[PDB]
Amino acid sequence: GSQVFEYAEVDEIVEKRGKGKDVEYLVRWKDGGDCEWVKGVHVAEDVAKDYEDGLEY
């Protein structure tokens, strides 16, 4: 409700530049050996527009 991005990780991330859910974070699979990237294609322009722009309109 203010941040233009969300982290879809299991324990940690690295990248953070998206929308509400259109951001592509990283995930150091809390219970894994490798770190993969999150899907930053979730064009939640509504979540984002309503997240950052929704509050500070």
């Binding site: 259109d22 699979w29 993969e36």
Partner: peptide, 14 residues
């Protein structure tokens, strides 16, 4: 479910 990355939530993408 998805081995590797995760999803914040239902993630609304139009």
């Amino acid at each position: 479910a998805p081995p590797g990355t995760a999803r914040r939530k239902r993630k609304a993408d139009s």
